[PDB]
Design a protein around this nucleic acid. Structure first.
Lengths: 273, 274
DNA sequence: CCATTTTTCCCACTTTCACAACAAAAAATT
DNA sequence: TTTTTTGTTGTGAAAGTGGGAAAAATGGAA
């Protein structure tokens, strides 16, 4: 089924079939694998792709755009959330009743725009119980934590955030997980400033600064500049209110009007009057 | 090649049964002996196994190995020795990769960043751009080669390669790493097109960059674009463009990006200040 | 301690692999 | 006309593949 695109990618690079032949796989099956009559070992497909310099990720995201079962769900909720359509939002709560963590997440997203339906305390505990179980956090766990984090009580939200920071999936070619973890640890830093868990705030500031080192995450760095400056404002440092004002000018200079008006409205509401 | 081992550690880490992942498509036992290096499963079935574990194929093969690819092994080792500014281990790595044409052409291009002696032949860069013109669909491999050798590619073919890359690169909506790079590379070729005032090239690149930035955060790409797009309006008889260039410089200042600040203000002071 | 779940070990039986010889088209020698 | 370069079939041999019985692991009762 994947043989076509292996044929289409290899013909597009104008390389022979027997270019890719080696000790690990004959030129034999390569002919029928590209014609859907045989299926190869996965290590040997990865070797074929290696000789073509094609990421396995590009391969399976250029063959189809029918994503993983998880990304179909997120596609479809962001689908209806941007459309504010509640009817079709509860549509997918019926398809995902047999999936616990997924169904807890829909209720969490739904109550942004419709407060009546909310996740049970028991469903959210079943979710955090699972998140506490996971030894290595991936995109799945990060999205689940981020989208339900306004129904997790603060103390367990921090403990889950700490576990996510310390045991998440790492690589220098795909920083999307690292970027998400950075945003999620800023989101729980701002809660720790409001409820003044300043020990948590200090811990998160050192983790956030480490996650932003050697990265072009300017958006995360700009909201961090504002939020860390708001912290230094409450910690007796006048530099902090300059950091908040510099962050507003970054939103202003970049035309990000939605972020500017939402952050300057909070600026003078907890600075002026 | 020992893909069951790491699948076992990922599956046990999520505390899920073997037979959760069992279905019509694969044994509940093959999973057990695939996980013990005694059998190797189809990759179609591995994508299904990973689907029920909610683990992206990208996370999976970047928890098994990370320098798994032949290409990323090279780049890691190049970024390692480049970060130490060590020419000895870099020129040794030019000898280990002598049998790879585009790869060793790329090393020479990076090597002369810190050591002007070695430069890519005009013939090697022509062999590279010839290959880039051949590729029907640009991937991470081609994008990195174009970006890391672009200061030895003459401008005219650099634009034509930039145009072909923008119009024919593969990007996933869950992994935007290729899309981010393509926008960085066509901003890099826009500012050169302004330096030569090829304003038709600048117009084409500006609208491609504007399209690539919609529904994205990418603040870094947006501030250098604010500088470069403002640099474009400066050469179009609009002083407003010089307000955009300095606003971008202050963004570099406010975010502590000293290296980018001195690199963009030095280009600012050479074509505004003289 | 035992009930239960989970994984490994043991049976037929299907598919895949590599060494092939196979035809066709390209490239080269007439 | 030839070779040479590329790709599509056939056939012992050796894997991959599913159901089930052992072995093991796990999780609470007394």
């Amino acid at each position: 089924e994947l043989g076509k695109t292996l044929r289409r990618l290899r013909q597009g690079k104008q390389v022979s079939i027997s270019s890719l032949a080696d000790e690990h796989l004959s030129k034999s099956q390569i002919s029928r694998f590209e014609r859907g009559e045989s299926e190869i070992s996965c290590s040997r497909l990865l070797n074929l792709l290696d000789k073509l310099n094609i990421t396995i990720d590009e391969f399976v995201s250029t063959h189809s755009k029918t994503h993983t079962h998880f990304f179909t769900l997120l596609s479809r909720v962001r689908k209806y959330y941007a459309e504010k359509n509640v009817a079709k939002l509860l549509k997918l709560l019926e398809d995902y009743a047999h999936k616990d963590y997924e169904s807890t997440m829909i209720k969490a997203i739904l109550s942004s725009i419709e407060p009546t339906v909310e996740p049970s305390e028991e469903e959210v505990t079943r979710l955090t119980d699972y998140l506490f179980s996971v030894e290595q956090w991936g995109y799945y766990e990060i999205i689940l934590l981020g989208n339900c984090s306004r129904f997790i009580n603060y103390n367990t939200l921090f403990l889950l955030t700490k576990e996510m920071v310390t045991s998440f999936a790492y690589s220098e070619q795909n920083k999307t997980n690292k970027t998400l973890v950075t945003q999620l640890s800023i989101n729980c830093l701002i809660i720790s400033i409001d409820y003044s868990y300043f020990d948590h705030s200090h811990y998160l500031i050192e983790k956030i600064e480490f996650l932003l080192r050697d990265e072009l995450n300017f958006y995360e760095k700009t909201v961090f500049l504002y939020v860390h400056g708001y912290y230094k404002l409450k910690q007796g440092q006048v530099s902090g209110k300059d950091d908040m004002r510099q962050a507003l000018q970054i939103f202003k200079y970049l035309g990000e009007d939605a972020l500017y008006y939402s952050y300057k409205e909070h600026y003078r509401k907890e600075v002026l009057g």
